[PDB]
Amino acid sequence: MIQNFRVYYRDSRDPVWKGPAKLLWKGEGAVVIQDNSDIKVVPRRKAKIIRD
Amino acid sequence: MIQNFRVYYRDSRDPVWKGPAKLLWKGEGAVVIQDNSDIKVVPRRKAKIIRD
């Protein structure tokens, strides 16, 4: 049950972090999120779980 | 709460279906699954929800 949680992540075109995203799937060292209208997979090592 | 469900999917190298997979995320016309030890996203139009 994920309440209001946000996630930041780095892109492959730039080691800088990217805007916040929505946390959907959560299990091993991987987290599925959604920034625009497209869901993608991001290694947990390149994502950070922030609270809202 | 996904009980025991399997999913088949076509690869981009061949329009033929691929072995069964595990159903994890389920929402819009997209379904996250896991065949080997790697989770990926597959359009619902290229996946089929089978029961186990």
Curated annotation (Swiss-Prot), chains A, B:
Free-text description of this protein's post-translational modifications in UniProt: Specific enzymatic cleavages by the viral protease yield mature proteins.
Chain residues forming the annotated DNA-binding region: 5-52
Identification of the protein by name: Gag-Pol polyprotein
Protein species of origin: Human immunodeficiency virus type 1 group M subtype D (isolate Z6)
